[PDB]
Design an enzyme around this catalytic site. Sequence first.
Site, PDB file in Angstrom:
ATOM      1  N   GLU A  54       7.160  17.174  32.912  1.00 18.56           N
ATOM      2  CA  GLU A  54       5.928  16.459  33.480  1.00 18.56           C
ATOM      3  C   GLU A  54       6.325  15.275  34.082  1.00 18.56           C
ATOM      4  N   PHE A 116      -5.060  21.161  17.789  1.00 16.49           N
ATOM      5  CA  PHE A 116      -3.698  21.604  18.540  1.00 16.49           C
ATOM      6  C   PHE A 116      -3.809  20.862  19.886  1.00 16.49           C
ATOM      7  N   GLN A 117      -2.519  20.228  20.084  1.00 16.45           N
ATOM      8  CA  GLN A 117      -2.330  19.638  21.260  1.00 16.45           C
ATOM      9  C   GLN A 117      -3.172  18.545  21.646  1.00 16.45           C
ATOM     10  N   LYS A 166     -10.842  22.367  28.041  1.00 17.91           N
ATOM     11  CA  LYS A 166     -10.833  23.325  28.528  1.00 17.91           C
ATOM     12  C   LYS A 166     -12.338  24.242  28.625  1.00 17.91           C
ATOM     13  N   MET A 477      23.424  -2.640  35.829  1.00 20.63           N
ATOM     14  CA  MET A 477      22.520  -4.031  35.950  1.00 20.63           C
ATOM     15  C   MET A 477      22.618  -4.525  34.482  1.00 20.63           C
TER      16      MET A 477
HETATM   17  C1  LIG Z   1       3.056  27.798  19.386  1.00 18.85           C
HETATM   18  C2  LIG Z   1       2.478  27.303  18.152  1.00 18.85           C
HETATM   19  C3  LIG Z   1       1.943  28.095  17.295  1.00 18.85           C
HETATM   20  C4  LIG Z   1       1.551  27.851  16.049  1.00 18.85           C
HETATM   21  N1  LIG Z   1       1.137  28.814  15.224  1.00 18.85           N
HETATM   22  C5  LIG Z   1       1.037  28.449  13.950  1.00 18.85           C
HETATM   23  C6  LIG Z   1       0.804  29.609  12.679  1.00 18.85           C
HETATM   24  O1  LIG Z   1       0.525  30.816  13.037  1.00 18.85           O
HETATM   25  N2  LIG Z   1       0.726  29.230  11.396  1.00 18.85           N
HETATM   26  C7  LIG Z   1       0.856  28.001  10.959  1.00 18.85           C
HETATM   27  O2  LIG Z   1       0.918  27.675   9.823  1.00 18.85           O
HETATM   28  N3  LIG Z   1       0.807  26.895  11.875  1.00 18.85           N
HETATM   29  C8  LIG Z   1       1.173  27.199  13.337  1.00 18.85           C
HETATM   30  N4  LIG Z   1       1.534  26.142  14.346  1.00 18.85           N
HETATM   31  C9  LIG Z   1       1.702  24.757  13.863  1.00 18.85           C
HETATM   32  C10 LIG Z   1       0.487  24.285  13.670  1.00 18.85           C
HETATM   33  O3  LIG Z   1       0.044  23.505  14.720  1.00 18.85           O
HETATM   34  C11 LIG Z   1       0.596  22.899  12.591  1.00 18.85           C
HETATM   35  O4  LIG Z   1       1.239  21.931  12.913  1.00 18.85           O
HETATM   36  C12 LIG Z   1       0.845  23.177  10.959  1.00 18.85           C
HETATM   37  O5  LIG Z   1       0.212  24.342  10.650  1.00 18.85           O
HETATM   38  C13 LIG Z   1       0.538  22.073  10.292  1.00 18.85           C
HETATM   39  O6  LIG Z   1       1.064  22.605   8.828  1.00 18.85           O
HETATM   40  P1  LIG Z   1       0.635  21.406   7.641  1.00 18.85           P
HETATM   41  O7  LIG Z   1      -0.767  21.454   7.606  1.00 18.85           O
HETATM   42  O8  LIG Z   1       1.500  22.117   6.718  1.00 18.85           O
HETATM   43  O9  LIG Z   1       1.449  20.326   7.827  1.00 18.85           O
HETATM   44  P2  LIG Z   1       0.664  18.544   8.469  1.00 18.85           P
HETATM   45  O10 LIG Z   1       0.073  19.083   9.794  1.00 18.85           O
HETATM   46  O11 LIG Z   1       1.834  17.805   8.440  1.00 18.85           O
HETATM   47  O12 LIG Z   1      -0.190  18.420   7.508  1.00 18.85           O
HETATM   48  C14 LIG Z   1       0.038  18.166   6.177  1.00 18.85           C
HETATM   49  C15 LIG Z   1      -1.175  17.681   5.510  1.00 18.85           C
HETATM   50  O13 LIG Z   1      -0.565  17.332   4.030  1.00 18.85           O
HETATM   51  C16 LIG Z   1      -0.860  15.818   3.715  1.00 18.85           C
HETATM   52  N5  LIG Z   1       0.187  15.462   2.900  1.00 18.85           N
HETATM   53  C17 LIG Z   1       1.249  14.808   3.451  1.00 18.85           C
HETATM   54  N6  LIG Z   1       2.277  14.200   2.685  1.00 18.85           N
HETATM   55  C18 LIG Z   1       1.678  14.402   1.563  1.00 18.85           C
HETATM   56  C19 LIG Z   1       2.047  14.054  -0.153  1.00 18.85           C
HETATM   57  N7  LIG Z   1       3.287  13.605  -0.575  1.00 18.85           N
HETATM   58  N8  LIG Z   1       1.106  14.542  -1.311  1.00 18.85           N
HETATM   59  C20 LIG Z   1      -0.284  15.257  -0.981  1.00 18.85           C
HETATM   60  N9  LIG Z   1      -0.694  15.602   0.802  1.00 18.85           N
HETATM   61  C21 LIG Z   1       0.240  15.100   1.494  1.00 18.85           C
HETATM   62  C22 LIG Z   1      -1.134  15.396   4.898  1.00 18.85           C
HETATM   63  O14 LIG Z   1      -1.609  13.926   5.226  1.00 18.85           O
HETATM   64  C23 LIG Z   1      -1.955  16.450   5.579  1.00 18.85           C
HETATM   65  O15 LIG Z   1      -3.374  16.550   5.541  1.00 18.85           O
HETATM   66  C24 LIG Z   1       1.888  26.448  15.603  1.00 18.85           C
HETATM   67  C25 LIG Z   1       2.136  25.730  16.330  1.00 18.85           C
HETATM   68  C26 LIG Z   1       2.761  25.861  17.741  1.00 18.85           C
HETATM   69  C27 LIG Z   1       3.550  24.738  18.758  1.00 18.85           C
HETATM   70  C1  LIG Z   2      16.569  -3.854  39.191  1.00 22.00           C
HETATM   71  C2  LIG Z   2      15.408  -4.502  39.880  1.00 22.00           C
HETATM   72  C3  LIG Z   2      15.705  -5.796  40.708  1.00 22.00           C
HETATM   73  C4  LIG Z   2      14.760  -6.340  41.628  1.00 22.00           C
HETATM   74  N1  LIG Z   2      15.152  -7.325  42.524  1.00 22.00           N
HETATM   75  C5  LIG Z   2      14.278  -7.902  43.217  1.00 22.00           C
HETATM   76  C6  LIG Z   2      14.543  -8.849  44.292  1.00 22.00           C
HETATM   77  O1  LIG Z   2      15.666  -9.396  44.131  1.00 22.00           O
HETATM   78  N2  LIG Z   2      13.746  -9.244  45.374  1.00 22.00           N
HETATM   79  C7  LIG Z   2      12.440  -8.568  45.365  1.00 22.00           C
HETATM   80  O2  LIG Z   2      11.539  -8.835  46.238  1.00 22.00           O
HETATM   81  N3  LIG Z   2      11.802  -7.683  44.641  1.00 22.00           N
HETATM   82  C8  LIG Z   2      12.860  -7.289  43.690  1.00 22.00           C
HETATM   83  N4  LIG Z   2      12.570  -6.341  42.679  1.00 22.00           N
HETATM   84  C9  LIG Z   2      11.143  -5.506  42.798  1.00 22.00           C
HETATM   85  C10 LIG Z   2      10.258  -6.412  42.192  1.00 22.00           C
HETATM   86  O3  LIG Z   2      10.083  -6.081  40.783  1.00 22.00           O
HETATM   87  C11 LIG Z   2       8.553  -6.244  42.534  1.00 22.00           C
HETATM   88  O4  LIG Z   2       8.414  -4.550  42.544  1.00 22.00           O
HETATM   89  C12 LIG Z   2       8.383  -6.279  44.163  1.00 22.00           C
HETATM   90  O5  LIG Z   2       8.985  -7.560  44.459  1.00 22.00           O
HETATM   91  C13 LIG Z   2       6.975  -6.523  44.244  1.00 22.00           C
HETATM   92  O6  LIG Z   2       6.785  -6.529  45.949  1.00 22.00           O
HETATM   93  P1  LIG Z   2       5.280  -6.488  46.470  1.00 22.00           P
HETATM   94  O7  LIG Z   2       4.924  -7.612  46.003  1.00 22.00           O
HETATM   95  O8  LIG Z   2       5.625  -6.568  48.002  1.00 22.00           O
HETATM   96  O9  LIG Z   2       4.543  -5.211  45.986  1.00 22.00           O
HETATM   97  P2  LIG Z   2       3.501  -4.929  44.970  1.00 22.00           P
HETATM   98  O10 LIG Z   2       3.925  -5.391  43.740  1.00 22.00           O
HETATM   99  O11 LIG Z   2       3.103  -3.492  45.263  1.00 22.00           O
HETATM  100  O12 LIG Z   2       2.243  -6.012  45.393  1.00 22.00           O
HETATM  101  C14 LIG Z   2       1.568  -5.785  46.582  1.00 22.00           C
HETATM  102  C15 LIG Z   2       0.616  -6.808  46.272  1.00 22.00           C
HETATM  103  O13 LIG Z   2       0.029  -6.602  47.689  1.00 22.00           O
HETATM  104  C16 LIG Z   2      -1.430  -6.349  47.510  1.00 22.00           C
HETATM  105  N5  LIG Z   2      -2.081  -5.635  48.624  1.00 22.00           N
HETATM  106  C17 LIG Z   2      -1.865  -4.366  48.414  1.00 22.00           C
HETATM  107  N6  LIG Z   2      -2.526  -3.365  49.357  1.00 22.00           N
HETATM  108  C18 LIG Z   2      -3.061  -4.232  50.157  1.00 22.00           C
HETATM  109  C19 LIG Z   2      -3.840  -4.103  51.352  1.00 22.00           C
HETATM  110  N7  LIG Z   2      -4.233  -3.092  51.879  1.00 22.00           N
HETATM  111  N8  LIG Z   2      -4.606  -5.543  52.111  1.00 22.00           N
HETATM  112  C20 LIG Z   2      -4.092  -6.523  51.371  1.00 22.00           C
HETATM  113  N9  LIG Z   2      -3.379  -6.919  50.449  1.00 22.00           N
HETATM  114  C21 LIG Z   2      -2.712  -5.540  49.854  1.00 22.00           C
HETATM  115  C22 LIG Z   2      -1.503  -5.988  46.105  1.00 22.00           C
HETATM  116  O14 LIG Z   2      -2.782  -5.705  45.503  1.00 22.00           O
HETATM  117  C23 LIG Z   2      -0.545  -6.974  45.469  1.00 22.00           C
HETATM  118  O15 LIG Z   2      -1.090  -8.227  45.193  1.00 22.00           O
HETATM  119  C24 LIG Z   2      13.430  -5.620  41.721  1.00 22.00           C
HETATM  120  C25 LIG Z   2      13.139  -4.638  40.983  1.00 22.00           C
HETATM  121  C26 LIG Z   2      14.144  -3.884  40.127  1.00 22.00           C
HETATM  122  C27 LIG Z   2      13.872  -2.778  39.425  1.00 22.00           C
HETATM  123  C1  LIG Z   3       5.894  19.094  26.913  1.00 16.09           C
HETATM  124  C2  LIG Z   3       4.932  20.140  27.093  1.00 16.09           C
HETATM  125  N1  LIG Z   3       4.660  20.546  28.343  1.00 16.09           N
HETATM  126  C3  LIG Z   3       3.623  21.830  28.628  1.00 16.09           C
HETATM  127  C4  LIG Z   3       3.306  22.815  27.420  1.00 16.09           C
HETATM  128  C5  LIG Z   3       2.448  23.822  27.350  1.00 16.09           C
HETATM  129  C6  LIG Z   3       3.964  21.863  26.010  1.00 16.09           C
HETATM  130  N2  LIG Z   3       3.828  22.667  24.763  1.00 16.09           N
HETATM  131  N3  LIG Z   3       4.756  20.882  26.108  1.00 16.09           N
END
Ligand SMILES: Cc1cc2nc3c(=O)[nH]c(=O)nc-3n(C[C@H](O)[C@H](O)[C@H](O)COP(=O)(O)OP(=O)(O)OC[C@H]3O[C@@H](n4cnc5c(N)ncnc54)[C@H](O)[C@@H]3O)c2cc1C
Ligand SMILES: Cc1cc2nc3c(=O)[nH]c(=O)nc-3n(C[C@H](O)[C@H](O)[C@H](O)COP(=O)(O)OP(=O)(O)OC[C@H]3O[C@@H](n4cnc5c(N)ncnc54)[C@H](O)[C@@H]3O)c2cc1C
Ligand SMILES: Cc1ncc(C)c(N)n1
Lengths: 582, 596
Positions: A54, A116-117, A166, A477
């Site tokens: 992503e 979840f997620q 969703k 750098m």
């Molecule tokens: C593709 C996918 C499919 C999945 N399918 C399944 C599935 O089918 N079945 C499944 O089980 N899971 C599944 N999961 C995982 C699931 O989402 C949960 O992450 C998992 O079930 C959480 O398990 P848990 O409750 O044991 O652990 P946790 O989520 O870590 O929860 C632990 C719990 O224990 C408590 N606790 C922690 N430490 C202590 C301690 N020292 N003493 C007392 N309590 C404590 C916590 O605070 C919390 O409430 C799936 C995930 C994905 C990505």
């Molecule tokens: C390794 C590294 C080294 C760098 N070295 C340099 C360097 O030596 N010299 C340098 O210049 N930069 C350098 N930079 C880049 C620097 O950090 C700034 O990102 C850059 O200078 C910002 O330029 P800017 O102000 O023109 O653009 P922006 O930061 O995008 O700012 C634009 C400004 O214009 C305004 N504005 C936007 N749209 C409009 C519009 N339609 N009408 C009127 N105003 C508008 C904004 O709102 C804002 O105040 C470096 C970056 C890195 C990663």
């Molecule tokens: C990082 C990430 N991108 C898309 C999906 C569906 C997932 N589980 N994780």
Amino acid sequence: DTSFVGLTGGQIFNEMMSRQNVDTVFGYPGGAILPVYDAIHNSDKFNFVLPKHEQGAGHMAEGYARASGKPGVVLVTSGPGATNVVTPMADAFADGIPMVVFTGQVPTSAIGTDAFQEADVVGISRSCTKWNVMVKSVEELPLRINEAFEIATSGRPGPVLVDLPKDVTAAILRNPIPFVMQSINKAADLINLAKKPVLYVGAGILNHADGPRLLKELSDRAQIPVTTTLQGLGSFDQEDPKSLDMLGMHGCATANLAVQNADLIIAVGARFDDRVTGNISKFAPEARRAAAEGRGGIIHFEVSPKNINKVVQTQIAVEGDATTNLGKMMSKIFPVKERSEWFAQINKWKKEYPYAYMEETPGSKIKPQTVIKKLSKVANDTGRHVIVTTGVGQHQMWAAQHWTWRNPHTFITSGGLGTMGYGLPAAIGAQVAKPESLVIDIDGDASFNMTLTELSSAVQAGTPVKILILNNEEQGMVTQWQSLFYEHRYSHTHQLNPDFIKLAEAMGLKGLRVKKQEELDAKLKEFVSTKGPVLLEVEVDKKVPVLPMVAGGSGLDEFINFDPEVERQQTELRHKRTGGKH
Amino acid sequence: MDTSFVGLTGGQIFNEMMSRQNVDTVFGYPGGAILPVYDAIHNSDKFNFVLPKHEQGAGHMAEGYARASGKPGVVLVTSGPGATNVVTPMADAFADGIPMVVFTGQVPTSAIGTDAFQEADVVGISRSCTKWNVMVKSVEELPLRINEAFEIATSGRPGPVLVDLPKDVTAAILRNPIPTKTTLPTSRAQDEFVMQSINKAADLINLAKKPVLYVGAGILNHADGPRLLKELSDRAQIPVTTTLQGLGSFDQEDPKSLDMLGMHGCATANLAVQNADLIIAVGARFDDRVTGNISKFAPEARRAAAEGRGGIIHFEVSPKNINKVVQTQIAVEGDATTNLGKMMSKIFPVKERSEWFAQINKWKKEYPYAYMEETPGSKIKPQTVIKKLSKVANDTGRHVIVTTGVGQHQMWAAQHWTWRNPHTFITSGGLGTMGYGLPAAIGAQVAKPESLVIDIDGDASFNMTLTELSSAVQAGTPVKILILNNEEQGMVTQWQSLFYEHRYSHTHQLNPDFIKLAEAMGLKGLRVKKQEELDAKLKEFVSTKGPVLLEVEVDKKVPVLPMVAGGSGLDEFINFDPEVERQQTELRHKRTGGKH
Ligand SMILES: Cc1cc2nc3c(=O)[nH]c(=O)nc-3n(C[C@H](O)[C@H](O)[C@H](O)COP(=O)(O)OP(=O)(O)OC[C@H]3O[C@@H](n4cnc5c(N)ncnc54)[C@H](O)[C@@H]3O)c2cc1C
Ligand SMILES: Cc1cc2nc3c(=O)[nH]c(=O)nc-3n(C[C@H](O)[C@H](O)[C@H](O)COP(=O)(O)OP(=O)(O)OC[C@H]3O[C@@H](n4cnc5c(N)ncnc54)[C@H](O)[C@@H]3O)c2cc1C
Ligand SMILES: Cc1ncc(C)c(N)n1
Ligand SMILES: COC(=O)c1ccccc1S(=O)(=O)NC(=O)Nc1nc(C)nc(OC)n1
Ligand SMILES: COC(=O)c1ccccc1S(=O)(=O)NC(=O)Nc1nc(C)nc(OC)n1
Ligand SMILES: Cc1ncc(C)c(N)n1
Ligand SMILES: [K+]
Ligand SMILES: [K+]
Ligand SMILES: [Mg+2]
Ligand SMILES: [Mg+2]
């Protein structure tokens, strides 16, 4: 309206994309967002690009937006899918890139149950989105989508997030749904009065189709030299004598000197970030003095009120779209015949402070700066439209300095956040925006390693991107800062790289490698001429600092310039301190 | 007061605190804002430093390390993108209760709130996915914040915490003495209250006729957990089922084992739970992948409760998870293991449970983990690979640790592997982060250098973080990476096959050559396609010294069963049926125009 009645939230999403004139969507499917993916299955309203991670979809959308001028659209699932796009969002938030991020969410009846997620995406993305929201009902879906696109593309463009439960996307819609003028004049007077004016242009000028044109008009009319930020590159023709090139931390000495000696600084679409101003208290002394005498100062053409007087007090602020306001005061600018005095000084600096660096010598390693210069010409010798993306680091700075920028929207780089790994995915997205363009990603080895999995995405999307890796086997750098401020103590800045050529081949691309200077010229030709995606690794010298450099409490005029003897002394010292390891 | 740190920089103080907190491993990636700390730990012998290619890798490595060692995983990254890149790992650890302390560099305090270079509001971003977080305002409080971070991450239900470190704070020299207490890492009524709940729990258990122990991750948060769980199970003859996160806490070789319950759990486990008069939940949170339709969950326990002869007992450490999903009759607060020890003597020893066991054995014979086995000319079956690898790995005599990605391969690994040892299954359950497998394996290998570490991954999951392959080489971690390649996002295509009439919307990705990728990354690559080559390749796989990746081409569109989904109760599961799988295949070919 009743044209959506009978449709699922997902089908409404499909239709809305069409109404918003969306032609491309970047995303990765997942459980929570399944109702939407089902409604867009085989859709013909837009193309779909699938990444491997992503973060890739996110950076791809950014490249797409910066190259096309249209908002990048992302569609991912809940939980990890959404957390995976936070970096791209923060990145787009810092650089003002229009992006609409759609995130699937668990059913409304599962929210708040540690489902979840499930993630609190609205809370997490709050600080990195101009606005976000969770859609509560399908009848509300169209309105939220329309607000999202409007917000993302207005004011200062930026990212926005729309959370999609969703059950909402699976649900079927049943019920049918329903002063500046003064600042412009005061600003024009100050300009007509300026004796040593300088145009400080930024990304803002590129947010309007006519920006570059008007900028040139004002520059030629009043004969004002133009310097641009990293994000401003491409807005002004660097071939024009009035071009000062890039200013800031790693900007041209001439550009920085002009800004420090100018009595009037016209800020156009720039925010005075800390990479540009150097030590803020030492920034533009002559402009501050001129302002004290009511004969100059700073004029700011900013669209966002909150960026006005945020870093430095300005004398005049023109709120709104820069391009628009520039066109308004044009008629109020007295044509300047010549500026011999000002131009004489600037030309002396140019000749005195060029982008110097240790050039190649018989038997030495290829120099990164040289590669950029050569590639710049070769790419230009194709006649094709060129777009350049980069990673983050020295290679990024060198690409900025040694390339000759002339066309707008041709430099796509991560500036504000400075996200390593931006190059490849951004190039892929840019390629999708301009299928005819020759998209080149000038990357570093460490940055490339960050998102190199998207290599297969390039092949699957049919994007013939050219990946150039300036391999110095180091996080350059950072290593430069360790050399300069940390007595050459390289703490965890040298990672183990994989074989890039074999990697490229494994991913389905053509891989090329250059070690000797005698082969660079030919490899570059083949690289740019190759049909389809290709990767070229160029082994460049190591521990090569980017100069000039303005860091710490130094002012823009207190830069560290290049010196061959100093580099030699630095190399010997580095060897002694690292035990002959670096 | 304490003056021993006066004169040191924040970075040096950090370095010093790591050894005081017994940290032997740090996962991280350098950057500008965090340079002062990196200069302070340069060549430090206080701990091993592990470098990934992406911060997300550092985060997942730290999780795998924590899950395998029982120690908190420590992350050290820079500001801005460096911090945002670890948001997924933190949300992941938060969901699964993994102890982790994340240190993120931050711009100078004077630059905060100015939209500074590489600045992000990390404390805001990470607030919902950490148990606690903080931004150190001065070097004076650095020791304090570090001690609070480790304490919070490792107590109650373990989880991640984040400590934001402004560059000026870490580069600053401590010039003021600080409280000794800040530098150094019960109730009579409450105890009697817990004992009272324990006596109530014992009474309920002593009258149960069809009891079921529903064990989760909580039992593993104590060294004696598995031992006490076993003692209680034998003493009172109580069958034991575990969640995905509890696998390994109970010897599945024991006749009283019910295996995993839930959405894809063993039918016997789900049936035992739906018919038990008493459910003794130990360290489990009744999540939605386990309970099935909540209103249909444990009907017999609800009935017994209504008649005052059973219900649900819950050994839970966090008040947040008590009575959150289902009404429980008796909540026993605190560490589960500790409380089981206190309750043991109050439990009446049971001679036997003939009827209960007979019924369970009846379900076991009727509902095994059945699936379509290989036939001449057919592709290798994913379930078969797991069963074969499981035996090959166990027979080595070494300690085995299994990590996985997220998807069908993950569920098949859980079902078909034979779990017997605690802390040997490391998987992303709550958040379900695809890409977890490899980095987690590397982290687990670092925690357990002598262990055979195997990452059972899916093709789509592997692609997410495959760049960490080179990290394994650089780290010296000989992880065994298994890729069950079905060239699809299996778990998603399964849902599309079932609820979206076989419409596979963007769930098939173009994979790279895994063997050539492995070799390009610096490790040995192996591939198997033919049934008769599987045994030999698996043997070569686990016997290889050094990191190795084995790609197994497996059949496609194979569903994970049993399955409980929608409004179905745990007992209304879909079971494997060969005829159905055939009909589905036919329907799929037609609906997809022969593409799938
Ligand atoms: C593709 C996918 C499919 C999945 N399918 C399944 C599935 O089918 N079945 C499944 O089980 N899971 C599944 N999961 C995982 C699931 O989402 C949960 O992450 C998992 O079930 C959480 O398990 P848990 O409750 O044991 O652990 P946790 O989520 O870590 O929860 C632990 C719990 O224990 C408590 N606790 C922690 N430490 C202590 C301690 N020292 N003493 C007392 N309590 C404590 C916590 O605070 C919390 O409430 C799936 C995930 C994905 C990505
Ligand atoms: C390794 C590294 C080294 C760098 N070295 C340099 C360097 O030596 N010299 C340098 O210049 N930069 C350098 N930079 C880049 C620097 O950090 C700034 O990102 C850059 O200078 C910002 O330029 P800017 O102000 O023109 O653009 P922006 O930061 O995008 O700012 C634009 C400004 O214009 C305004 N504005 C936007 N749209 C409009 C519009 N339609 N009408 C009127 N105003 C508008 C904004 O709102 C804002 O105040 C470096 C970056 C890195 C990663
Ligand atoms: C990082 C990430 N991108 C898309 C999906 C569906 C997932 N589980 N994780
Ligand atoms: C994503 O979760 C939710 O949105 C979610 C969260 C909590 C309860 C119910 C849901 S759901 O019932 O509406 N969808 C669901 O469970 N989907 C899903 N999709 C895939 C592809 N795999 C799996 O489970 C292994 N589940
Ligand atoms: C990370 O930024 C801050 O923390 C930051 C942010 C705003 C102002 C000042 C700083 S700083 O002055 O203290 N450090 C700094 O600028 N460091 C840095 N390190 C590397 C390796 N490359 C570059 O710049 C190309 N800068
Ligand atoms: C993603 C990322 N990690 C570390 C640094 C230094 C950077 N610029 N980007
Ligand atoms: K240039
Ligand atoms: K099993
Ligand atoms: Mg490099
Ligand atoms: Mg798969």
